Every structure is written in C-alpha cells, then in structure tokens.
C-alpha cells in the first residue's frame, strides 16, 4: 500500500521520463522499457504481456498530460489513507 | 499473496529469507555452490557440496593430507617428504576468517541508478536486475568486508587472504538489510563455525544505523533503542558468540554513522529521478518516503534539525554504550575491541583522492554509504587495527609465495 505507492511512482517516472527523452509516446515507451528487460525469468515476455493486455486500458483513463503522482493516484497505487497526508514526489503545479 | 495456494507459498519464501542461509545447500552446512540466494556471493564456496564436513574455514583434518576439507585451494602430500602440503604453508600461521555481523551497509545494499536514469538506459541496464533481486539487492561480493570481486582500495577478505593465503574462502557476510541490536539473534544463528573445529575468526559487528531508524509510524525518538537495551542486547549477542568462536578469536564492536551527514550533503541535490527535469531533490524523497511511512531512517532524513539532532545524539549515546561494554566486559573465547565510525578520516581521505562527499552515497536511496565509502571504511578499520592491535589480523605468511606456487589461484572463489 505504502510500497505499492512507491513501485507505481518509479516505473510510471521511468516510464513518463522514457517517452520524453525519445518524444515518444506512453505506449511507445512502455513497449522499450520492456525491451530493456531481461529474457531470464520471463520478465520481458510477462513486461510484454502487462503491456498490450493492459496498457491501453491504462492510458485511456487520462485525456491530459499529468505526472507520476498523478497517475498512481487514479490507478489507486497511491490512496489517500485516513488520518495520513496526501504524498508526492513530484512538484505540484500551482 | 491472499489467495490460499498462492499464501502457502508466500510464507515458504519468506522463511527462506529469514533464517539468512542458502537455499542451495545439499549437506546443509550454510556453504553453497550457487551465488546468490545466501550462496558464495555471501560466504565462502562450498568446495564440496556432499558433505558437512567440507567447508571453508575448518582446521584441516590429517592437515588435508587426502582432500580440501576446508576449501582453501592447499592440501595433499609432497611426495619429496612425505609430509602434508597444508602443514608445511599453514601450521603455525594462525589462519582465520572474517565475518560480519552487519546491516544493509555491511551487506552493501544498492540499486543501480542505471535503472532508473533514462538518459543513459540501454539493452545493458538491467542484466543484473536477477542478481540483485536474489541477493536481496544486496552486493556482498562487492562489499567492504567480504567482497572478493573487481571493485566496480580492497575489502577486509581480501588483505586477510594477501595477508596469510591459507585464509583463502573464509568469509561470511552474516548481513541483513534491517538488522539491528534488536534482532542480531537471529543473524547468531545463521552464523557457521565451530568452536572446537574451525580456525578462529574476526567477528566485526557493525549495526551502524537500525537501532535509531526506526520509528516509520511514531515520534522516532521513542522508537529507538535505548542504551540499557542495547547494553542487554549486546551482552546477550556476546555471551552467544562466546559458545561459537573458537579461543583466539577477535569481537570488534563498529560505532554508529554520523547520518547527519546526509541531509547536510543531499538536501539541495537532484535524485536520479529528478536529473532529467531537475525536479526532484533528496528533500522530496525524504518528505515522500516519510509521508508513506516507509523511511528507512525518519530521524535523520528529516527537514527538522532538531529530531536530526536528537538522532545523532541517541547514535553518540548507544556508541558509548558499546565502547563501555568493550572496556568493561570479557569473554573467554575472544578479544574484544570497539572501533568508533571513521567518519572524519574517510571523508578526508576522498577529498585528497578528488573526490566530493555526496558521491560517498547511495544515489538512490540517498541513505547508505556506497561502494567506495565502504572501502574507504574498510582501508581505514584495517590500518587503525594493523597500527593498534598488530595481533588481530595475524602475522604475514612466509609460504605465501610457495602456496601460489603450488596451488596457483587456490581454486578460485
Ligand atoms: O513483511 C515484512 C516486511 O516485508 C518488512 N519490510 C521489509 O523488510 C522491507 C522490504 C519490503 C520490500 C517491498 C518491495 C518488494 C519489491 C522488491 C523487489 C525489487 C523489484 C525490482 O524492502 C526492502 O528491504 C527494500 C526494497 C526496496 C525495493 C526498491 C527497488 C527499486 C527498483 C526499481 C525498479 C524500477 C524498474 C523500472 C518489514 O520489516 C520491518 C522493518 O524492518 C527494518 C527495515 N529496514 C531496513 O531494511 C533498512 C535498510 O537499510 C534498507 C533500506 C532500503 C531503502 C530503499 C530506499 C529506496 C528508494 C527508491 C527511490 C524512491 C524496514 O524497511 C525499510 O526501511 C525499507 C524501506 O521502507 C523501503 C523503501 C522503498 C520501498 C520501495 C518498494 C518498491 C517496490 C518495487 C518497485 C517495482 C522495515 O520496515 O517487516 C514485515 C514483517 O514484520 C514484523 C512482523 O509482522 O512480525 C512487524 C514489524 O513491525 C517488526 O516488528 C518485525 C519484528 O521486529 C520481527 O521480529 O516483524
Ligand atoms: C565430495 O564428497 C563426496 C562424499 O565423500 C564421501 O562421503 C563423505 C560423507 C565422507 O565420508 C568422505 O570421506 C567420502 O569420500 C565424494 O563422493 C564419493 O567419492 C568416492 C570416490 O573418491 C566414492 O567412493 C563415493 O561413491 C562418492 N560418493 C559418495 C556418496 O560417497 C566426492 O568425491 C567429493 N567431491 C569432490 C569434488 O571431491
Ligand atoms: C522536530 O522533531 C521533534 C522530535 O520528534 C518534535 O518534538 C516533539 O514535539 C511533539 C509536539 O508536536 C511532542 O509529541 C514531543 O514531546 C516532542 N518530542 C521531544 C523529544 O521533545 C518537534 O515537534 C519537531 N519540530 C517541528 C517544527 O516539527
Ligand atoms: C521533441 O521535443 C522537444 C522538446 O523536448 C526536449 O527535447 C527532446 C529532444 C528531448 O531531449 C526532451 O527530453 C527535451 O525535453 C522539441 O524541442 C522537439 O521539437 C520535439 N521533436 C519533434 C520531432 O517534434
Ligand atoms: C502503469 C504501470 C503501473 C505500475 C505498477 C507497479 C506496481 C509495483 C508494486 C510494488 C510491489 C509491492 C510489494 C508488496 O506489497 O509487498
Ligand atoms: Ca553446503
Ligand atoms: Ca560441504
Ligand atoms: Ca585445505
């Protein structure tokens, strides 16, 4: 919850920062960050996977550029806990 | 992990973890021909992995005359004298091992900013990610201690093994990420070696953060350990070291960090993640890691000076206790030294080589010192120790020469 925070703001920072680096897009992006992967352990192939079953899913639910923290708090990795502050890595806007 | 099959196997895995031995293990004697999951990336390589009675570090039986019972690369006969191999290069040599008692530093816990640097990501970044994931992400096998490896200033291990080369595979890297006064016990038990057996050893305990970084979900000072606890606890972890060393071996207690250090060095610098934008300070991460409750070190990566403070003076207080137990207290089976953490001469010695203070860090976690810190470390713990307490370390091996020549690379590690 707290660690499934963290994780989601990693890759989906590799991921964002991937696409702007290549002038890529988010799928685009996602599909090199699995290239980089390993064969060992199925990761690419599981990578691979995750990607096309899910991804467009996922960047359907954002007709707006947004950043990390954003983006994990809509997919619920980062959930705002009762009685705890609102977390974020990145600056806010305003 | 909540499904019910899938739960059987969540909580097999994290045995394994737990007990700090290797999974691959057929004689069970904590030796492994496998690297990573507790294997010989962490203690010596089991150079035979059928018998319980192979392993490194043990006074060789009939002075290894017939096999390598203790791994080190020396046995059989000179057929010009009939006499053991092992016997004429190592008897009266005083062998021993190294091992360490420690935490993520001590295990050299480190994520690659390759990972997460995008501006230099490649096919290559990530070849390592299954090494690291089994180690724990952990690099003993490049650690100040126990490291035997190419150094992406060499590791205790190793001057041991240039000291006298009959030492050759006794390490134990007996480290884990959260270990701390509190839960050495524990770590005790993964711990190999026989009191009546095998060669001596060098035990360094260095717990040189946990027991004031607790403290994720509370006021963090009164989360850490307090010195009358870690007085017990220490006592306690010495009287059990006491039943395992063999007579004649040496106990160093290591003093805390000065985690001040890092708040003063990183506060204003970018994260690997926030290099691309520059968005992104170890402040942040602090402040985002804090806000989740899952700092590794609340009371010293904080913006309030004042629980920093706290910290530090709770980390002065608990490494007085370890040095009032070194003074006071005696062991028959071991010597017992305390080291305070060598700050000032490790940072010193950096800046005459070139070097600034924030690359002595982690980049990632901007918590534990980094590869070359805890080389830095280990250069100054054995010149202090050579200087101080000659006796600890051994005297040099006259054969040196003769084993290399006989046995070459001594099997390798
Ligand atoms: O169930 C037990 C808990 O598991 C245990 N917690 C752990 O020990 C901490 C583990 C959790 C791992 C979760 C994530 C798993 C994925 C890892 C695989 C990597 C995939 C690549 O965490 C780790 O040890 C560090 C893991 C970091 C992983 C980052 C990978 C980054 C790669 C990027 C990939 C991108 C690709 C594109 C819990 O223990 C209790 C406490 O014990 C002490 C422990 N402290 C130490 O370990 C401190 C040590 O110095 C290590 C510090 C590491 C700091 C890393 C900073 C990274 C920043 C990255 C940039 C933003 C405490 O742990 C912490 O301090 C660790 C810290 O909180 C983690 C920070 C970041 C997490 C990031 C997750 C990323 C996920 C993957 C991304 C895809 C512990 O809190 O104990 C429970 C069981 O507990 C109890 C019990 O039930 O009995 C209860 C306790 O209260 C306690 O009492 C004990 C008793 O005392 C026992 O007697 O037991
Ligand atoms: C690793 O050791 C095994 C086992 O050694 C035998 O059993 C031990 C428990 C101990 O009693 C030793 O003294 C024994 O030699 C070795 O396997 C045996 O090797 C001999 C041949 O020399 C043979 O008679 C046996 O059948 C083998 N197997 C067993 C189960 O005994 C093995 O050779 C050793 N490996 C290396 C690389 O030296
Ligand atoms: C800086 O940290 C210290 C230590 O955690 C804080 O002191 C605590 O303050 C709270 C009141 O808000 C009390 O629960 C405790 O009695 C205090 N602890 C001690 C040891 O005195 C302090 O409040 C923090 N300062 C700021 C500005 O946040
Ligand atoms: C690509 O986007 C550019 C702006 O982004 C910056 O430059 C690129 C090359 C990356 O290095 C990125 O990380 C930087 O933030 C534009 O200047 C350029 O016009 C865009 N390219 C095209 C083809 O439109
Ligand atoms: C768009 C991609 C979404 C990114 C999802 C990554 C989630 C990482 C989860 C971290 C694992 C938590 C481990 C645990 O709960 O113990
Ligand atoms: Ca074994
Ligand atoms: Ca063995
Ligand atoms: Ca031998």
Redesign the interface.
């Known amino acids: 919850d707290?660690?499934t925070?963290?994780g989601c703001?990693?890759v989906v920072?590799?991921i964002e920062?991937?696409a702007?680096?290549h002038n890529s897009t988010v799928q685009a992006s996602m599909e090199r960050l699995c290239?980089?992967?390993?064969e060992?352990?199925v990761?690419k192939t599981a990578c691979y996977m995750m990607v096309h079953v899910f991804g467009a899913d996922i960047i359907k639910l954002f007709d707006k550029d947004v950043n990390a923290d954003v983006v994990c708090h809509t997919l619920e990795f980062c959930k705002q806990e009762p009685g705890?502050?609102?977390?974020?890595?990145?600056?806010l806007p305003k | 992990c909540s499904l019910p099959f899938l739960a059987k196997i969540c909580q097999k895995i994290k045995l394994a973890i737990k007990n700090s031995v290797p999974i691959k293990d057929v004689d069970s004697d904590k030796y492994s021909i496998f690297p990573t999951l507790r294997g010989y990336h962490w203690r010596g390589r089991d150079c035979n992995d059928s018998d319980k009675t192979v392993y490194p570090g043990r006074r060789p039986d009939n002075w290894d005359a017939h096999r390598d019972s203790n791994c080190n690369g020396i046995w059989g006969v000179d057929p010009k004298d009939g006499i053991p191999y092992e016997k004429k290069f190592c008897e009266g040599s005083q062998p021993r091992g190294i091992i360490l008692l420690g935490d993520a530093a001590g295990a050299h816990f480190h994520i690659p900013p390759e990972?997460?640097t995008?501006?230099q990501?490649?096919?290559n970044?990530?070849?390592n990610?299954?090494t690291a994931v089994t180690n724990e992400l952990d690099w003993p096998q490049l650690s100040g201690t126990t490291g035997f490896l190419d150094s992406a200033e060499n590791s205790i291990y190793l001057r041991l093994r240039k000291r006298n080369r009959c030492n050759h595979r006794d390490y134990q890297n007996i480290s884990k990420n959260g270990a701390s006064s509190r839960n050495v016990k524990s770590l005790i038990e993964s711990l190999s070696r026989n009191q009546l057996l095998d060669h001596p050893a060098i035990v360094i305990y260095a717990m040189i953060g946990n027991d004031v970084c607790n403290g994720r979900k509370t006021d963090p000072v009164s989360a850490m350990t307090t010195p009358e606890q870690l007085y017990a606890n220490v006592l306690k972890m010495l009287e059990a070291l006491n039943s395992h060393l063999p007579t004649g071996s040496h106990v160093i207690l290591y003093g805390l960090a000065h985690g001040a250090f890092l708040w003063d060095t990183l506060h204003s610098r970018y994260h690997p993640?926030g290099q691309?934008?520059k968005?992104?300070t170890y402040t942040?991460?602090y402040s985002?890691?804090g806000?989740?409750?899952?700092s590794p070190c609340p009371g010293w990566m904080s913006a309030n000076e004042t629980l920093r403070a706290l910290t530090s003076e709770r980390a002065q207080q608990l490494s007085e206790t370890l040095r009032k137990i070194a003074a006071s207290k005696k062991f028959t089976n071991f010597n017992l030294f305390y080291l305070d953490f060598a700050f000032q001469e490790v940072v010193e010695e950096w800046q005459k080589m070139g070097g600034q203070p924030w690359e002595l860090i982690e980049a990632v976690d901007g918590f534990h010192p980094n590869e070359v810190a805890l080389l830095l470390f280990a250069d100054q713990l054995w010149e202090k120790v050579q200087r101080q307490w000659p006796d600890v370390l051994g005297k040099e091996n006259p054969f040196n020469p003769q084993i290399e020549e006989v046995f070459g690379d001594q099997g390798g590690h």
Do not use: A, I, T
């Open positions: 707290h660690y925070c963290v703001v990693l920072s590799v920062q991937l702007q680096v290239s980089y992967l390993p060992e352990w990761l705890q502050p609102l977390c974020h890595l990145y600056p | 990972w997460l995008v501006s990501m490649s096919v970044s990530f070849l990610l299954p993640l691309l934008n968005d992104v942040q991460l985002f890691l806000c989740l409750q899952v």
